[PDB]
Amino acid sequence: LDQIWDDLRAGIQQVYTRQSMAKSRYMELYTHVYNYCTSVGLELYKRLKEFLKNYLTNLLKDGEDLMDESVLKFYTQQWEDYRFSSKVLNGICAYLNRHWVRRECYEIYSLALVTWRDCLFRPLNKQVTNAVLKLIEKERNGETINTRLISGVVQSYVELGLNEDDAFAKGPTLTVYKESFESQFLADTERFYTRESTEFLQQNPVTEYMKKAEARLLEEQRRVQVYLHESTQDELARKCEQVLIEKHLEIFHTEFQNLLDADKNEDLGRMYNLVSRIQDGLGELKKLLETHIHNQGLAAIEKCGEAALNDPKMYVQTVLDVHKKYNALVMSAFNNDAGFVAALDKACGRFINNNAVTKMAQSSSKSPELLARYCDSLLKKSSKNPEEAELEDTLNQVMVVFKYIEDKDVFQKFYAKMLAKRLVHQNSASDDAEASMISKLKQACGFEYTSKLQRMFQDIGVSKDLNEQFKKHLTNSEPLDLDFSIQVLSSGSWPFQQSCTFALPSELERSYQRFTAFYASRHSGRKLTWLYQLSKGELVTNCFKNRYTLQASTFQMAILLQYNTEDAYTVQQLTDSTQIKMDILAQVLQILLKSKLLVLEDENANVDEVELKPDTLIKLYLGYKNKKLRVNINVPMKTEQKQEQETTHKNIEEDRKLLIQAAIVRIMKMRKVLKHQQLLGEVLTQLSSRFKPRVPVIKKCIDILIEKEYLERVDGEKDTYSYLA
């Protein structure tokens, strides 16, 4: 009764600001209560709550309305000494908490806290927090701050999370924290930087802004691991982010660009990581770098120009420069972010298939050509040789450019007409070079792509074999007068073209008939068509006051062996004896003249410009003299290379048509009845991997496919066709 409560309070009034009271006191207090609940004793709690609800009201009286860094030095220590005591008090009321509170079917310490948010539901919710912010505002400087002053404050509101009846609290209590602080924290923190952002924004640098707004973000993260609670950090961060990065994006985009125009590159990394944060942040930088490098490329080649147009190393190289340049940027400053790798790739693709170069040449397809021509210049017998890895490496580079080639049919087709010649003439740099190229290309475009490159190869080993068969057949009952050697290529597997009606000069009759005989001993019917436009042979002179070994084309040898008799023939004369078409003689005579084995009547004639007329004499120049014994005058027409490129390109145009038809039919079969647009669309979907047909070309194929009755229009329907078998 009123007895134990008078002395119980006597102690409870002491358990606070405890003078290290002897355990004798607690023991009394404990059983003081043990009995008070046995004499329900419900009243006791009623007394306790009252005692608490009072002491604090009185506590508030002190420090009453004294916001600040006042409540600081205060609300901390106060909550502190209160806590412990309330803790000790629960330990005391223990018996109470037991048999009273399970009877429900309301602890004291809890009561202690609830009783405290009635010190909160007053000054300490409102001005104290607004003190904390005052201290926190020392984000700028100062020190020092004494985190301890805020930690207690914080851990308080956290703890006072609430406890008026849920039982215990499933997730974190943390309703008071946010609503009494977190909310009031963030809002006040934003303005800080929102003022400093715009402050800086105008007074300092787009570089020395990120550098800072970078660090502060870090700080804000720091000041949460020590004046926290756990997620006020991302929410805190999510906030400082919006304030530093992303309402400043346009204030960053214009800067990002300049950071490109100047290779100022760690400025881009921070530019990135910052925007990396904001969701959908890169979306634009990814378009700026995308469109940016595109320029660089479209420019760096633009400089080269009329040169690049005919200089593969330069063209391909200038390209592999812009690429390998900006690639390392994405790998570096942009953390090889696939999104930014796309930018690069999309741009590279854009300017590799279209640029000052292709424009001049008037066609996207030059690019693959120049990439073809490059490789050949690379797989061709080099003046010396190239270092293994070196080649293999550049060859792996050519493939980076290839990776963006739109007309890969064009590349392939060239790389083919080129391998042809290289194979045909044992003129390859390293054999393992080709072998690697073919592989390097097989990977992307499968065996099918490289099949023909391999057919040619394997078909060449054969010829080598058969040649021996003949070289052997010689040291047999059959001796040949001159060093003979032949390449017997499968009319089907090579890209050659028989020839220009030759007359086979006598000195070659023997070797022709013999091997022609020797080949009879193989394929009963097999036809040999002798590619004279492509055959070697050497000449050895006795007429010039020096011994030259002319390395010459068969046509040159033909016209040259002609001088073994009457000395100076007009053009008509050679085009009758050699039986080699004027159109072709002239260009060859052009060459023979340019090397002065031949010299025309007029010693001033600029052979390299003069026009050959049937009647124009072609004197053998006997005074001839070369700075070399063994001269290789077999560089045919200069123009040939042009007609090759030309005729070889047109050889493709007609080849895309068939592949296109062969798609239409393919599609029209699978579909049976289809609308124009969809038909067209499909065609692309198909052919993209090799080349993007131009609608008007397909449109053409469609008709051809109708004429050839493979598919017809559906009478009484706008743009529709039916697969008619």
d(C-alpha 82, C-alpha 10), whole Å: 17
Burial per residue of 590-619, b for 16 or more beta-carbon CB atoms within 10 angstroms, e otherwise: bbbbebebbbbeeeeeebeeeebeeebebb
Q: Does residue 486 belong to the site contacting other proteins (CB under 8 A)? A: yes
Taking the least distance from each CB to other proteins, the nearer of 252 and 415 is 415
Q: Which stretch binds other proteins (CB under 8 A): 44-52, 121-129, 230-238, 524-532?
A: 524-532
* Minimal distance, residue 451 CB to other proteins, in Å: 8
Contact assessment for residue 140 and residue 195, using Cβ atoms and an 8 Å cutoff: no
- Considering only 483, 603, 608, 609, the residue that binds other proteins (CB under 8 A) is 483
Q: Which residue has the tokens 């070196």?
A: 390
Nearer to other proteins, 173 or 450 (CB): 450
Q: Which of residues 409-438 bind other proteins (CB under 8 A)?
A: 424
User: Is position 534 an interface residue for other proteins (rule: CB under 8 A)?
Assistant: yes
Cα–Cα–Cα angle for 480, 484, 486, nearest 5°?
A: 135
617-620 β-sheet, strand order: 568-570, 617-620, 598-599
Mask: binding to other proteins, 584-623, rule CB under 8 A, as x and -? ------------------------------------x-x-
Cβ closer to other proteins: 444 or 658?
Answer: 658
Q: Among all chains, which residue has been given the structure tokens 């306790």?
A: 48
Provide the minimum distance between the beta carbon of 536 and other proteins in the complex, in angstroms, as a whole number.
3
Interaction between residue 511 and other proteins (CB under 8 A): yes
Which parts of 671-700 interact with other proteins (CB under 8 A)? 700
Q: From the CA atom positions of the chain, what is the Rg in Å?
A: 47
Evaluated on CA atoms 449, 452, 455, 459, the torsion sign reads negative
Closest separation in Å from C-beta 302 to other proteins: 36
Whichever of 401 and 557 has its CB closer to other proteins, that residue is: 557
**Residue 232's CB: how many other CB atoms inside 10 A?**
23
Size of the site for other proteins (CB under 8 A): 68
Residue 240 CA to residue 194 CA, distance in Å, equals 9
Among 15, 243, 308, 489, binds other proteins (CB under 8 A): 489
Whichever of 49 and 700 has its CB closer to other proteins, that residue is: 700
CA distance 691 to 169: 67
Q: What is the dihedral of CA 655, 661, 667, 670, to 10 degrees?
A: -110
Contact between 494 and other proteins by CB under 8 A: the answer reads yes
Paired residues of 720 in beta bridges: 675
Residue 380: its H or E element: none
- Contact call for residue 496 and other proteins (CB under 8 A): yes
- Rule CB under 8 A: say whether 299 interacts with other proteins: no
- Please identify which residue in 282, 320, 560, 571 interacts with other proteins, judged by CB under 8 A: 560
| Cα–Cα dist 293/549, whole Å | 53
How far is Cα 527 from Cα 519, in angstroms, rounded to an integer? 9
Length of the chain, in residues: 725
Using CB under 8 A, which of 445, 528, 607, 637 touches other proteins? Answer: 528
Residue 537 engages other proteins in binding (rule: CB under 8 A):
yes
Cα dist. 401→375, 565, 702 in Å? 12, 55, 33
| Parallel, antiparallel or unpaired: strands 598-599 and 673-675 | unpaired
The two tokens of residue 187 are: 């809002």
Instruction: Say which amino acid occupies 170.
Output: K
Q: Return the amino acid letter for 609.
A: E
Strand partners, 380: 428
Neighbours of 326 (CB within 10 A): 23
Count of other CB atoms within 10 angstroms of residue 142: 9
Considering the complex, what minimum distance in angstroms separates the CB of residue 285 from other proteins?
48
- Nearer Cβ to other proteins, position 12 or 531? 531
Segment near other proteins (CB under 8 A); pick from 155-163, 268-276, 379-387, 502-510: 502-510
Q: Which is nearer to other proteins, 23 or 527 (CB)?
A: 527
Quick one: 17 or 542, whose CB is closer to other proteins? 542
Q: Shortest Cβ distance from residue 300 to other proteins (Å)? A: 38
- Name the minimum Å distance from CB 519 to other proteins: 7
Token pair 């804000």 in the structure block, residue: 220
State the distance between the two ends of the chain, measured CA to CA, in whole angstroms. Answer: 111
Q: Report residue 692 as tokens.
A: 């993007």
Does the protein bind other proteins through residue 545 (CB under 8 A)? no
Encoded amino acid at 720, one letter:
T
Q: Which is nearer to other proteins, 145 or 462 (CB)?
A: 462
Nearest-CA neighbor of 549 among 453, 425, 632, 442? Answer: 632
449 binds other proteins (CB under 8 A): no
Piece of 15-23, 254-262, 525-533, 636-644 that binds other proteins (CB under 8 A): 525-533
The CA-atom distances, in angstroms, between 369 and each of 366, 372, 419, 454 are: 5, 5, 13, 20
Stretch that binds other proteins, among 147-155, 276-284, 431-439, 538-546 (CB under 8 A): 538-546
Per rule CB under 8 A, is residue 518 in the interface with other proteins? no
Q: By CB under 8 A, is residue 546 in contact with other proteins? A: no
SS3 568: strand
Q: In terms of CB distance, is 545 or 718 closer to other proteins?
A: 545
Judged by CB under 8 A, the residue of 563, 691, 721, 723 near other proteins is: 563
Among 523, 547, 672, 694, binds other proteins (CB under 8 A): 523
Cβ closest to other proteins, residue 3 vs residue 506: 506
Nearer to other proteins, 398 or 668 (CB): 668
What is the DSSP-derived secondary structure letter of residue 618? E
DSSP string computed for 1-38: -HHHHHHHHHHHHHHTT-----HHHHHHHHHHHHHHT-
Residue 625 as a binder of other proteins (CB under 8 A): the answer is no
CB proximity list for 167: less than 8 A, separation 6 or greater: none
Site residues (CB under 8 A) for other proteins, limited to 452-481: 452, 455
Q: CB-wise, 40 or 724, nearer to other proteins?
A: 724
The verdict on 703 binding other proteins (CB under 8 A) reads yes
The single residue among 142, 492, 623, 696 that binds other proteins, judged by CB under 8 A, is 492
Binding of residue 557 to other proteins (CB under 8 A)? yes
Q: Which of 288, 655, 666, 713 binds other proteins (CB under 8 A)?
A: 655
Closest to other proteins by CB, 197 or 450: 450
517 lines the binding site for other proteins (CB under 8 A): no
User: Checking phi first, is residue 537 left (phi over 0); if not, alpha (psi -120 to 50) or beta?
Assistant: left
Q: Residue 134 or 536: which CB sits closer to other proteins?
A: 536
**Nearer to other proteins (CB atom), residue 34 or residue 512:** 512
Nearer to other proteins, 242 or 493 (CB): 493
Q: Which residues bind other proteins (CB under 8 A)?
A: 424, 452, 455, 482-496, 498, 505, 507-508, 511-512, 515, 519, 523, 525-532, 534-543, 549-550, 554, 557, 560-561, 563-565, 567, 620, 622, 651, 654-655, 657-658, 700, 703-704, 707-708, 725
